[PDB]
Structure formats: C-alpha cells, structure tokens
Amino acid sequence: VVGGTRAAQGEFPFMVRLSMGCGGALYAQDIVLTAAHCVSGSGNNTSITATGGVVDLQSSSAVKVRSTKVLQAPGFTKETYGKDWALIKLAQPINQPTLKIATTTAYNQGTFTVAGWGANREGGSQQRYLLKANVPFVSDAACRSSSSFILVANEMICAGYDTKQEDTCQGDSGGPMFRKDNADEWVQVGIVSWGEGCARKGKYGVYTEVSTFASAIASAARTL
Amino acid sequence: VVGGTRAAQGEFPFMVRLSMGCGGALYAQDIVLTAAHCVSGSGNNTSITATGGVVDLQSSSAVKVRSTKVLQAPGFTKETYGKDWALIKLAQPINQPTLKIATTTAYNQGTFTVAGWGANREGGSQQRYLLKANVPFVSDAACRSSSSFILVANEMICAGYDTKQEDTCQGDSGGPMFRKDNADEWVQVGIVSWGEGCARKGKYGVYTEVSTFASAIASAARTL
Ligand SMILES: [Ca+2]
Ligand SMILES: [Ca+2]
Ligand code: NA
Ligand code: NA
C-alpha cells in the first residue's frame, strides 16, 4: 500500500498473508479468496502457507496453515483480461471472522478501504505490518479513459486518486477491497488485481468486480 | 527480455514456460529448475502447467504437462535475500535435452545468454514468442555498489549493461542464464531473480549463483 498507515491488531481480522507474496481474505474459516494471478492454476496444492490472526507477520500469535487445494477462476488468462479470482482451501480453519462478499451491485460505489503487506512505493519491499488506505470509486468510463490495457467493464472495478499518492501496489494483490454495507458490516467489493505502476499520476487501481463473480465463487467453494 | 530478438524454434530446447508467469529450465526431463520466488513453498502441487518444446506458447506442438510437487530452496526469504531457486516435478517428461548446471565457478564470467517470455520493456505484456539476449558478467563489487537492496555475493551473480537496453524483465524470472562450458555444451550459471526496473541506467540484472547451490539442487532433486 502506497500512502498507507498501519492497521490495528484485530481491525481487519479476515486478512490473510499468502506465501507467494499476496494477500487474501477469509471467505470461510478454511477458504481464502485471493486473485487468480496469485496462483498457477487449479489442483491439489499443499505448498502455500497462509498467515492469519495478526497484523505483524513476525508475531508469535500468528496462525500459519498450509493449503490443500486451489481453484483458479475458470477461463482465467491474465489480469488485464479479467476473471482475476481464486480460492485456496486450507488444511485447518483460521479462527477469525470471515469477510462477506458482495452478491449485488449495491456497494460498487463510494469510498473503499484496502489493506495489505505489499510495497509502499513502486519497486519497494514487502511490509512486516499490515497497511491500510482509503480509495474512492472511479467509474469504468473514467478508468478506461485513463488506461492503456484493456478494461473488461463487467469484471473490473476501479478506485483511486488522480495525483494523491495513495494506492495498492505489488504484493497487495489478492487482498480485499471493502466498505460498509447497509447493515454496518464490512462487505468485499473488490480483489486487488492490477495497475499501471503504483500511485501514478492519472492512473488508478483495478480490482476484480466481486459481485459479478460471487455466484461462481460460491460454486467453486462448494468443490473444496 | 528487453533488447531481445526472437529465439529460433529448437535453439534452446531446455526452455520451459510456467503457468504463474515465470520461466524455467529443464533440469531433468521431469524436473524444472526455476526461481524460489516463482513458487509458494514446498509440497504437493498439481496446479502448475509447464509448456515445453516450443518457442511459440500458442503452438499446436506445445508440450503442456502438469506439476506434481514443488521444492522451494530451504530458508528462502526474499529475492534480494538470496537462495532464489526451486524445483518443480512434472507428471510426465518433456523429451528435450536438459540443461546441465554449473557446479564450479569456472564459467561465472564472460558473456552469458538469457531467454524468456517476459516483458520487453518496463510494464510491458508477457510475450508469445521466446526472446533471447546476451548480457556480460558484472563483478559483485560493481553490482553491490550499484544496488539499493542487499547483494549477497556468494548467492547472486550479476550481469548486464550500465546503459544499453538489454536485460531480463518481469516474467523472465526463473529462466536460466547460461553459456558454453569447455566441452562446448550449454551450462547454467544463473537463474533470473531480480533487478531494479528493467535495463535501467546504472542498474544490472541479479541472478541466482547456481554454482553455490548445485549440491543442494541435486540433493533436492534426489528426493522428488
Ligand atoms: Ca466495472
Ligand atoms: Ca556473486
Ligand atoms: Na493516480
Ligand atoms: Na543498466
């Protein structure tokens, strides 16, 4: 996160760090929702470690759990190309609250919150402590005007600033973009997906449009 | 590869593309040597697809084989932090000549060849067709001096140019850096690991120093 500050311990308990250098969210206590581009494909996979429970990745309170299998969005090709979601089944649950995902378009607007352990600047190192930032919605029309690479409107939600240096960055991929719902609970509207650089002038962040995929995500989760 | 030219079909039969968007070398017909940072850890993994046999990833002749297991260098932390190697066991062999690795420092000098399907410029798209370039050895002293991040001298070999636009880039990671040995056969001296930008002025490419790890790589392979 560029232009971020530390999340408090316990603030976003659904956050998970994944050992390929991505974030994720606890969709179920034993299922992590992340980006398709954070995984290689679908199959059995006991090589990923999920770190839950803590903002400080060096904390002895961390819960470290291995994966058992991965389901990458059917049809996934590359970020700028859409369908950037995946599920990781965990061998054991992480006993933390889950993050509900958006199943309608009701929340695909307003001011979002992002969080991750990715870089704090283009080209930078990953972070020890979870950082957070707020980023405002940017319409598909405004995002496509800014963009070089294809925007698949139905599959991508943009957010960020024109010149303010506040954005997700490398290693934030797969984390949730979220906001409050009408019942004052967090709801996931995006997955950190891609951007042209980080916090570049005139460029925004691009996130998987979770409401488009929520049905497919539930179907995938039932396979795990 | 920045400043690359297309590799001919058959030129480097040992090149492998991996479905997380990395390169690799055919270390054994059923074992790909790649970068640690291209995998998540060690364990079972049937989710990676290796594409062998072809310079054109879309070729009707491509050999697409799934993984069965991954072994990430024990103690790997961080590209700039060394030990950037991993092995991927394949469910089926790729019937191509394998790339012998260096076990001595005899070839850690001179002009190397690099190849990959990574970007041809910073922020570019991955390539359909394999590209190659030549990059000269750069001493650890010159490389350290140039670098903003940790250079672990024994674990990292640098190569490239001060200003000429010829380098590996994003998505070339995991591919081999190689040259001829005394028997005029290809030998692998490096694994594409990291760099500050791509072909940036005053910056080089940083490669895993394979001779340091050759014994550990063979012992890992023996267990797969
Ligand atoms: Ca949209
Ligand atoms: Ca060295
Ligand atoms: Na911007
Ligand atoms: Na340079």
Side-chain angles (χ1 to χ4, degrees):
Chain A
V1 179
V2 179
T5 63
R6 287 181 184 180
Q9 175 60 38
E11 186 175 2
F12 304 134
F14 52 76
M15 289 298 306
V16 175
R17 183 65 171 170
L18 300 168
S19 63
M20 74 296 286
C22 286
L26 287 182
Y27 175 83
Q29 290 191 329
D30 62 354
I31 303 171
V32 179
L33 176 61
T34 189
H37 80 261
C38 291
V39 302
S40 300
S42 298
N44 293 334
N45 187 345
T46 65
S47 74
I48 302 163
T49 295
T51 302
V54 292
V55 294
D56 174 359
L57 296 174
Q58 299 300 325
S59 175
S60 61
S61 299
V63 177
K64 290 183 174 276
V65 183
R66 258 185 211 278
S67 58
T68 61
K69 65 199 95 186
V70 179
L71 194 153
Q72 190 187 60
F76 178 73
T77 282
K78 9 122 331 163
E79 299 95 291
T80 302
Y81 257 9
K83 305 209 174 44
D84 196 10
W85 67 266
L87 298 178
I88 304 168
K89 179 65 184 306
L90 301 183
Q92 285 168 131
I94 295 170
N95 188 16
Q96 295 290 339
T98 56
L99 181 57
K100 180 182 190 188
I101 73 169
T103 59
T104 68
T105 60
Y107 305 116
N108 292 350
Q109 54 171 273
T111 296
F112 308 122
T113 304
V114 293
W117 294 268
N120 70 7
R121 69 183 152 85
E122 241 182 87
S125 301
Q126 304 298 288
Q127 299 297 297
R128 171 175 174 176
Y129 300 94
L130 185 64
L131 298 185
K132 67 173 186 163
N134 288 173
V135 287
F137 177 69
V138 174
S139 70
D140 292 333
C143 197
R144 188 183 304 298
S145 295
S146 74
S147 189
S148 303
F149 280 94
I150 96 178
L151 198 80
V152 185
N154 293 352
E155 298 187 358
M156 299 178 188
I157 182 159
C158 301
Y161 302 93
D162 180 8
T163 61
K164 190 185 187 191
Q165 297 298 99
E166 189 175 21
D167 194 9
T168 48
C169 198
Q170 188 260 130
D172 292 323
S173 288
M177 180 166 77
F178 57 91
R179 54 158 279 181
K180 288 294 178 63
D181 71 14
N182 293 161
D184 207 16
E185 291 282 0
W186 294 123
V187 65
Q188 185 172 353
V189 299
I191 301 164
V192 180
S193 181
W194 60 276
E196 295 183 55
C198 308
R200 283 199 188 158
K201 289 169 161 209
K203 302 291 186 178
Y204 310 106
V206 190
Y207 301 80
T208 313
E209 184 160 329
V210 169
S211 52
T212 291
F213 301 111
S215 186
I217 288 166
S219 299
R222 277 189 293 278
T223 74
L224 300 176
Chain B
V1 180
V2 183
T5 65
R6 284 206 190 173
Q9 173 63 35
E11 186 169 5
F12 305 124
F14 53 74
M15 288 301 304
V16 181
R17 183 67 170 170
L18 299 167
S19 65
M20 78 294 288
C22 286
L26 200 66
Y27 172 82
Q29 292 190 322
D30 67 349
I31 302 172
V32 181
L33 175 62
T34 191
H37 81 259
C38 294
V39 300
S40 298
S42 301
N44 299 332
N45 191 340
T46 65
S47 78
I48 306 165
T49 299
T51 303
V54 294
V55 295
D56 178 358
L57 297 176
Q58 297 300 319
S59 179
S60 299
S61 300
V63 176
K64 292 185 159 278
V65 177
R66 291 213 161 243
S67 58
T68 60
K69 300 174 187 143
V70 181
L71 194 287
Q72 191 187 58
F76 177 67
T77 307
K78 182 193 126 152
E79 290 100 286
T80 304
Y81 258 33
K83 305 178 170 48
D84 196 8
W85 69 264
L87 297 175
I88 302 167
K89 187 70 168 336
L90 302 181
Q92 301 168 114
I94 297 168
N95 186 20
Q96 295 288 342
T98 55
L99 181 56
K100 186 173 186 333
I101 70 167
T103 63
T104 76
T105 60
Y107 307 113
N108 290 350
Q109 53 174 262
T111 300
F112 309 129
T113 304
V114 292
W117 297 266
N120 66 24
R121 63 197 194 285
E122 289 191 19
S125 306
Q126 301 297 289
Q127 299 295 299
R128 173 171 170 174
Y129 299 93
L130 184 68
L131 300 185
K132 66 176 187 168
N134 294 146
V135 289
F137 174 80
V138 174
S139 69
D140 287 335
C143 196
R144 182 183 299 293
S145 293
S146 76
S147 177
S148 291
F149 297 99
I150 299 178
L151 185 82
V152 183
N154 296 344
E155 299 186 356
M156 298 176 191
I157 186 163
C158 301
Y161 302 94
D162 177 67
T163 57
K164 181 183 173 182
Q165 292 310 106
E166 194 171 14
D167 195 8
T168 45
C169 197
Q170 195 266 111
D172 293 321
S173 286
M177 182 167 75
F178 55 93
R179 54 159 282 178
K180 289 304 192 73
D181 67 13
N182 285 167
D184 195 32
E185 297 181 354
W186 294 120
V187 66
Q188 185 169 354
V189 298
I191 302 165
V192 179
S193 181
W194 61 277
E196 293 174 56
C198 308
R200 284 222 192 140
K201 182 176 240 135
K203 304 290 192 174
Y204 303 105
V206 189
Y207 300 80
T208 308
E209 181 160 329
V210 170
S211 53
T212 294
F213 301 111
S215 292
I217 291 166
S219 170
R222 175 180 184 271
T223 72
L224 275 181

